[PDB]
Ligand binder design. Structure first.
Ligand code: WY8
Lengths: 177, 177
């Protein structure tokens, strides 16, 4: 349904184009930019998938243990008539007991915002109960696309969750690899 | 169908967020940046909508009479966990008889690329004959959304066309206003 088109739109428009050349940006940020004494940013992009489609624009305010650190060197590409369209990513630190536990490139999945707004708009004809299924369907279709993909070899880890600690949730995924 | 979700995704993710503050960027580009002797960039964003979903990434190579001139001051905004996500636009000149006839902010509608790719991917389950309808449906739903919209007051002009001169086609729209 709607999530299927958004899931493919996510892969074709963003993931297919930044995942193949994300490791090099992380290498550049670790070697030439990262504080000489603050460890290394992980090699994988971690994508948050809140099934309730609650996607705040600032990660830091969604969890005190998560706070912005830096941005990777931005990626530019001529896209659909725009010269040097800028694809940017933000590096975040994860705090356990007040000490930095993990550093990674973390972001939400923006198509989930689009689903949330469509449920809020009258002309979209989208219901709140419809949203919760489309949120799950979006994650499924995204998983299927990345399962056979020449860009998500070891570049992309999905983080889905339903709320009855996000920092502990993300940390859980980093330590599994 | 798929186009409906992409059409709303286009409005909610891009148009709702740059149209309200596009005129000011054009003013800044005309007053503080534009060559003192090259006229003024139009106040409206013109969006190309090729119904065949053929969307080249460089406008200049799609028509010799269209050629890149400059970029507007980029718009930044914290979006879905990305700090200072950059929304950029490119200014193009239109050539009639080899002399500059019009200058405007011109770009393709990227969701049409997404539709084209989905028709090319096996797992998407999207057909080429399905595409041509979804291309039309995408334009219709976009028109409906902008018809009652507090951001497309006089900010956005859609340019749809089917190929049996793009520069003459775009020029035709500028002179109607
Ligand atoms: N830089 C990025 N950072 C993070 N995620 C990104 C980025 N780029 C793409 N994605 C993801 O890929 C999806 C499809 O993207 P696409 O190529 S089809 O174009 C998108 C969509 F049609 C719609 C946005 O909706 P949304 O964000 S929920 O979906 C996106 C998003 F999930 C309007 C278009 N649009 C947005 N911003 C710009 C811009 O600056 N220039 C030109 N067009 C732009």
């Amino acid at each position: 349904n709607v999530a299927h088109g958004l899931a493919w739109s996510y892969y074709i428009g963003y993931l297919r184009l930044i995942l193949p050349e994300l490791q090099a940006r992380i290498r550049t940020y670790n070697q030439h930019y990262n504080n000489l004494l603050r460890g290394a940013v992980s090699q994988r992009l971690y994508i948050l998938l809140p099934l309730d489609c609650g996607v705040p624009d600032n990660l830091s305010m969604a969890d005190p243990n998560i706070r912005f650190l830096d941005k990777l060197p931005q990626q530019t590409g001529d896209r659909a008539g725009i010269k040097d369209r800028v694809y940017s990513n933000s590096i975040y630190e994860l705090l356990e007991n007040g000490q930095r536990a993990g550093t990674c490139v973390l972001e939400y999945a923006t198509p989930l915002q689009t689903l949330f707004a469509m449920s809020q708009y009258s002309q979209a004809g989208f219901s709140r109960e419809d949203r919760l299924e489309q949120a799950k369907l979006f994650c499924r279709t995204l998983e299927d696309i990345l399962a056979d993909a020449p860009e998500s070899q070891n570049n992309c880890r999905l983080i889905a969750y339903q709320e009855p600690s996000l920092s502990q949730e993300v940390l859980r995924h980093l330590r599994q690899e």
